Amino acid sequence: GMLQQIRGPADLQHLSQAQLRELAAEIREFLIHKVAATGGHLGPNLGVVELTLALHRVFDSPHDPIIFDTGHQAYVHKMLTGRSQDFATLRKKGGLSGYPSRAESEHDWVESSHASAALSYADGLAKAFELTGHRNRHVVAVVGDGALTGGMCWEALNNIAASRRPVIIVVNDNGRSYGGGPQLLFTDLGLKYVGPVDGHDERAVEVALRSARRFGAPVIVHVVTRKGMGYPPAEGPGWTATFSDALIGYAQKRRDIVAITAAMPGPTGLTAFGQRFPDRLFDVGIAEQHAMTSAAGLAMGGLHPVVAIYSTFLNRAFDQIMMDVALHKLPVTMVLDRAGITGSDGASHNGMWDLSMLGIVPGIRVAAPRDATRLREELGEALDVDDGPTALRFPKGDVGEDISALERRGGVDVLAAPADGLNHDVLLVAIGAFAPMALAVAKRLHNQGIGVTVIDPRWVLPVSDGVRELAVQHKLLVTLEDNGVNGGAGSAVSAALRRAEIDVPCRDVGLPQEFYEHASRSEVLADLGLTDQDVARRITGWVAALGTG
Amino acid sequence: MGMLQQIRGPADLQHLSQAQLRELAAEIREFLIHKVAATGGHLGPNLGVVELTLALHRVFDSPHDPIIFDTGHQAYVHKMLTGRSQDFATLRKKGGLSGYPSRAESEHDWVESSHASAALSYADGLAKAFELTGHRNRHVVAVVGDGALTGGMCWEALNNIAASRRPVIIVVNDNGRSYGGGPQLLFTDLGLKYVGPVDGHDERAVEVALRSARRFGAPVIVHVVTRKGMGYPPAEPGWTATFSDALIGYAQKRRDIVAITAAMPGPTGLTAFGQRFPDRLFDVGIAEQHAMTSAAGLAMGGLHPVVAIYSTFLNRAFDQIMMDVALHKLPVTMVLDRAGITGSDGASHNGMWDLSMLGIVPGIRVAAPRDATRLREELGEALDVDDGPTALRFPKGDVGEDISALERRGGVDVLAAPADGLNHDVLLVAIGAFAPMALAVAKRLHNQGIGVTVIDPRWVLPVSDGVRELAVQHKLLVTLEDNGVNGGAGSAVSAALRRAEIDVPCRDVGLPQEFYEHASRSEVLADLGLTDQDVARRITGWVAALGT
Numbered sequence A: 001g002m003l004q005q006i007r008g009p010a011d012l013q014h015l016s017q018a019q020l021r022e023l024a025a026e027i028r029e030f031l032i033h034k035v036a037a038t039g040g041h042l043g044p045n046l047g048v049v050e051l052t053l054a055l056h057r058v059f060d061s062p063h064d065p066i067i068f069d070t071g072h073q074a075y076v077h078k079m080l081t082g083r084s085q086d087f088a089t090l091r092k093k094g095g096l097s098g099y100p101s102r103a104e105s106e107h108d109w110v111e112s113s114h115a116s117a118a119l120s121y122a123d124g125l126a127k128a129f130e131l132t133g134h135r136n137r138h139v140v141a142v143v144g145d146g147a148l149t150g151g152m153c154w155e156a157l158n159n160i161a162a163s164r165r166p167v168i169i170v171v172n173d174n175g176r177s178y179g180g181g182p183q184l185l186f187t188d189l190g191l192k193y194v195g196p197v198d199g200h201d202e203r204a205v206e207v208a209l210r211s212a213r214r215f216g217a218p219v220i221v222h223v224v225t226r227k228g229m230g231y232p233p234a235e236g237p238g239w240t241a242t243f244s245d246a247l248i249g250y251a252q253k254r255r256d257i258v259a260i261t262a263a264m265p266g267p268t269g270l271t272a273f274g275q276r277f278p279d280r281l282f283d284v285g286i287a288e289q290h291a292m293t294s295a296a297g298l299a300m301g302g303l304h305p306v307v308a309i310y311s312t313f314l315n316r317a318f319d320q321i322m323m324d325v326a327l328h329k330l331p332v333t334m335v336l337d338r339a340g341i342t343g344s345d346g347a348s349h350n351g352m353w354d355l356s357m358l359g360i361v362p363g364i365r366v367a368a369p370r371d372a373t374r375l376r377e378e379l380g381e382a383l384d385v386d387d388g389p390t391a392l393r394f395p396k397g398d399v400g401e402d403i404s405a406l407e408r409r410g411g412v413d414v415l416a417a418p419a420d421g422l423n424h425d426v427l428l429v430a431i432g433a434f435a436p437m438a439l440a441v442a443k444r445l446h447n448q449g450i451g452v453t454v455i456d457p458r459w460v461l462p463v464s465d466g467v468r469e470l471a472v473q474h475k476l477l478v479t480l481e482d483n484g485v486n487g488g489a490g491s492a493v494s495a496a497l498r499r500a501e502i503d504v505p506c507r508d509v510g511l512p513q514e515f516y517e518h519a520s521r522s523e524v525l526a527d528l529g530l531t532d533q534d535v536a537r538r539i540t541g542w543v544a545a546l547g548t549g
Numbered sequence B: 001m002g003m004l005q006q007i008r009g010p011a012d013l014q015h016l017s018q019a020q021l022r023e024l025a026a027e028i029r030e031f032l033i034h035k036v037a038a039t040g041g042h043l044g045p046n047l048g049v050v051e052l053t054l055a056l057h058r059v060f061d062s063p064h065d066p067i068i069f070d071t072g073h074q075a076y077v078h079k080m081l082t083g084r085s086q087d088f089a090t091l092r093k094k095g096g097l098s099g100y101p102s103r104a105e106s107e108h109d110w111v112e113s114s115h116a117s118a119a120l121s122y123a124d125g126l127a128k129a130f131e132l133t134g135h136r137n138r139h140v141v142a143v144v145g146d147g148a149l150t151g152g153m154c155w156e157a158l159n160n161i162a163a164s165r166r167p168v169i170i171v172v173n174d175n176g177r178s179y180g181g182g183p184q185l186l187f188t189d190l191g192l193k194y195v196g197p198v199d200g201h202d203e204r205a206v207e208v209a210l211r212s213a214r215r216f217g218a219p220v221i222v223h224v225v226t227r228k229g230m231g232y233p234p235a236e237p238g239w240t241a242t243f244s245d246a247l248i249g250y251a252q253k254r255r256d257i258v259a260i261t262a263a264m265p266g267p268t269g270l271t272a273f274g275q276r277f278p279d280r281l282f283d284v285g286i287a288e289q290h291a292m293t294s295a296a297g298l299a300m301g302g303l304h305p306v307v308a309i310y311s312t313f314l315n316r317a318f319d320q321i322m323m324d325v326a327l328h329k330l331p332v333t334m335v336l337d338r339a340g341i342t343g344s345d346g347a348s349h350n351g352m353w354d355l356s357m358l359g360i361v362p363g364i365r366v367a368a369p370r371d372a373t374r375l376r377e378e379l380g381e382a383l384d385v386d387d388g389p390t391a392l393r394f395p396k397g398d399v400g401e402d403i404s405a406l407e408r409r410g411g412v413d414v415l416a417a418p419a420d421g422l423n424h425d426v427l428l429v430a431i432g433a434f435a436p437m438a439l440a441v442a443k444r445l446h447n448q449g450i451g452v453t454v455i456d457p458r459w460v461l462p463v464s465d466g467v468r469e470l471a472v473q474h475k476l477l478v479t480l481e482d483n484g485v486n487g488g489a490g491s492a493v494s495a496a497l498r499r500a501e502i503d504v505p506c507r508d509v510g511l512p513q514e515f516y517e518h519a520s521r522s523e524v525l526a527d528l529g530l531t532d533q534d535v536a537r538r539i540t541g542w543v544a545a546l547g548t
């Protein structure tokens, strides 16, 4: 049993090639059984077993930093750096992170899962080691073919190529046979190129890595791997499926609708759209910037693009939404799935920034579906906005059960009104998927004699006349949102009331503006007090304090 | 008379002789010098593309063939050849010709954004649209400078363009080398057909290359070498100077300070820093994303980077600030010059987003200097924050005399207090460049018998204890900021008060969340009612409504 004997990378040093073959087979058996139980990125990690062995046989981590781009493929790295006994807890609260973690190991450097950044870290680290006079530190960046489609890699390669400071660029390419990688050639950029190397020939990978280190300047080592290598399998109604079906339905009648994904046609629900309309689906790679600006170009050509990008990753396209789409008043609809807490993938995956970021965009119209019917209606309304950008945001998981409104008042859906004998005390503005929690809050407060109107504004931005009209009829306004509080929906509602000379007290119940550790979505929300029990308690205290000072 | 006056549109070039195009180029240069020299416009970049622009409009049929300029500051010759040569007396003036292409001005203009490196992405989308709508024989031409080509968007776009035979012609206008600011990487062997290098001042040779590209039937790169300022040798007391001097002084003692610019060492005040510490200045090209994440890597190696990027361009680095710097709690200081209204470059240049964008970043610390001494002071404080990102933001132009405080309470500077005998009616939270306005507003209100405390919070984010402590002592809080109101400083102050159970009425006096047309900074502010007269009037109304 060799895996159990690996205390750290140096224990690989004197293994025979036969022993390394046996060890790699032990590693695959481990991954298959451990990751099947916890969930996680099985396929990408099976693909890098020999690559990771070779990296830790040639380089001296962390004196030689091994930076994983995206970081979802560092399980083998963790198993070879003292953490093989920790995988029962993988991606669980308090357990092993699904990405590298500096708190777990000195061998881990970058915790962000946002792709294509590794080479930029590498350039800065190499610059730092020169400035501090550290001898013989070899920065190694492991970059997938998908990550290599992102613009950050081009900026970093241009900067790296301007210097003889050694950076070793390991391209982990599983988009081709020895797929989702670059269409552009990177054999002739002006940087030394080694390969293509069979990334499941462990000794060949070491030979190439050793040649790269000897060269003493920037070098690209192109390694070809197979996703899921060694495991054939790898080699409840959700919001996504409701979106997919609704988009197809609208596009059957409207030929001007096109769809764009940044490398995630399946997860965004666009695969089925492309099957029906193959000429109207574009996969631009891991390139959210180009997704949005190419959408602007499509709209300048008369089309109405639907850009489906998971909330957190849309951060990369802020300036394109602002200067390429909004400045030109172009009809681009953005669909942000995985909005709000996602939980298991940690801080860099939670979609908790979109309402705050999109709120800076002049004239933007943003909707947060509360259920399946409202996702279908609001998508149709967005597709009917022809003079500027629109966005829909909704969480991962089971679609919310339909909640029909008591009445619609200036675009706002009234979901609950104060019961007879109770007054209009609290206006609870329920954003998106928090409608059920708001209704439960209203029932608890009812039992305490506190009258609550629950509304779903539908179109959260801009804040509508209906919200302002109902706000003046209540004594306290509470916004409940699955988004960071800073610049979020609650702050936007407060700002709109004050602009309208309405000074009803407002409170912003949302996610504190912090980076969250991995846990289940329900665990994160409970730890933050985003439960109907805790929210009702807070509102009780605010109501009792009214006029006390 | 001359030929330029006879050019009604591009087709009037069609039958000119080579000798005539040569005379016309010289007339265009003389015109550009007459109307742009010493005005603040982009003379050099436009002198560089006289022959290129003539050749483009001799080969392509705009706008059936869209000609998309990257950045757009080099489209003056394009405008002269598309019916606007009589409009240059108004260039970059309120109500006059834009400094960038404008769809309202001309069917020949497509992209109005000045943010660089986006043209090829527009071009990919446009080519895709023409295919989907069945338009024949529309050749999309993107004119991309060598500097713009250092931006990541170009690589994403070229990757996508290369996946299709849809005709996109990539005209690289390279003035970073002689026939530097351009890519270090080669683009001769990307898998895309490459033509050149072409002498960009040989108008005939440029036409020959463009015709070869136009008939190729697939994407093609045409590499044209131009000389910035061709034909005009001269083209061939500021906040920024205060920053420059302060940074050099701190780095003399702190060897761990490094500076990074995204292709603007001169305008950001970093040239003088590199001259003193040449190993500690990095120019990463037009690559704000790489600037921030390589800053993260430098910080991971034990250094304290100072990233100087103009406010509006920092939008491009939002996710790197968030997931590469802030997530790792790294000590990177961001210095945002041209913060607030800049005016003459129009909507895509005003630095009116940074307080709103930065406020989303968990834990961030953001300062807005009110004067030179506070820039020096707050920069030093930023450099001493070792556990997360800091930012300073300040406006273009000259810095006036220091504004002295009456006292500092909880980090907040009290600039004025209600006169003896007046009540504490208004807390006027003056952000950065608007401290003089706030003091003028307070004097007007004083004459009306309204007592105002004016504070400079210095560190606007997070909102400080001092702001909360003073707010409860007043009947009204007004935040005055040179930033968009949505998610800006005023909304942040309001949110902090409400989180602390303080319901004192707050008003957010800032820039409406709109894209502004070009005009002078003072004109934009006046048009918005951001003057001490107008703001005092609004506050008078709010105070009258509260009574007491």
Ligand SMILES: CCCCOP(=O)(O)[C@](C)(O)c1sc(CCOP(=O)(O)OP(=O)(O)O)c(C)[n+]1Cc1cnc(C)nc1N
Pocket: A040, A044, A047, A070, A072, A073, A113, A114, A115, A116, A143, A144, A145, A146, A147, A148, A172, A174, A180, A227, A262, A263, A264, A286, A313, A316, A345
């Ligand atoms: C179970 C839930 C787990 C969610 O996490 P995910 O969605 O699996 C992940 C890691 O995140 C990835 S990997 C990936 C392709 C890598 O392709 P590539 O680099 O070739 O790697 P490979 O696996 O082939 O080895 C993409 C597109 N994403 C999302 C993503 C999108 N946009 C940006 C800027 N950054 C991202 N990080």
Ligand SMILES: CCCCOP(=O)(O)[C@](C)(O)c1sc(CCOP(=O)(O)OP(=O)(O)O)c(C)[n+]1Cc1cnc(C)nc1N
Pocket: B040, B045, B048, B071, B073, B074, B114, B115, B116, B117, B144, B145, B146, B147, B148, B149, B173, B175, B181, B228, B262, B263, B264, B286, B313, B316, B345
């Ligand atoms: C006096 C007021 C006028 C301000 O306007 P500026 O600052 O001149 C301008 C146009 O903006 C430019 S041009 C330029 C180099 C172009 O280099 P290149 O493409 O090679 O052009 P060329 O050599 O032909 O001039 C750069 C860096 N900037 C700023 C800039 C920075 N970051 C981003 C994302 N986008 C920008 N647009």
Ligand SMILES: [Mg+2]
Pocket: A144, A145, A146, A172, A173, A174, A175, A180
């Ligand atoms: Mg891959």
Ligand SMILES: [Mg+2]
Pocket: B145, B146, B147, B173, B174, B175, B176, B181
């Ligand atoms: Mg140039």
